[PDB]
Design a protein around this ligand. Sequence first.
Ligand SMILES: C[As](C)(=O)[O-]
Ligand SMILES: [Pb+2]
Ligand SMILES: [Pb+2]
Ligand SMILES: [Pb+2]
Ligand SMILES: [Pb+2]
Ligand SMILES: [Pb+2]
Ligand SMILES: [Pb+2]
Length: 87
Amino acid sequence: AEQLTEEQIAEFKEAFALFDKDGDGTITTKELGTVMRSLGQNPTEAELQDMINEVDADGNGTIDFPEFLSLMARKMKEQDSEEELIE
Ligand SMILES: C[As](C)(=O)[O-]
Ligand SMILES: [Pb+2]
Ligand SMILES: [Pb+2]
Ligand SMILES: [Pb+2]
Ligand SMILES: [Pb+2]
Ligand SMILES: [Pb+2]
Ligand SMILES: [Pb+2]
């Protein structure tokens, strides 16, 4: 019911940085693969691109912070809708 706050955005930027190791404002398939493997995953090279294209709104090949935030916003809107239904 509420849009992302400055503090939430700041926390999301830290999360973004966990993927974007070189801090160039993007998340590549390579960086994505590194994160997936750290969670017990092992997707394929081309399989990583599919996940990227799914979040990559401007279709430039990588994920930028705005698209990352958009996803987080959609997720929050989802949990908020459910938590308001659980009643
Ligand atoms: C969802 As509200 C805090 O604007 O009532
Ligand atoms: Pb409000
Ligand atoms: Pb505060
Ligand atoms: Pb923090
Ligand atoms: Pb990067
Ligand atoms: Pb963008
Ligand atoms: Pb992009």
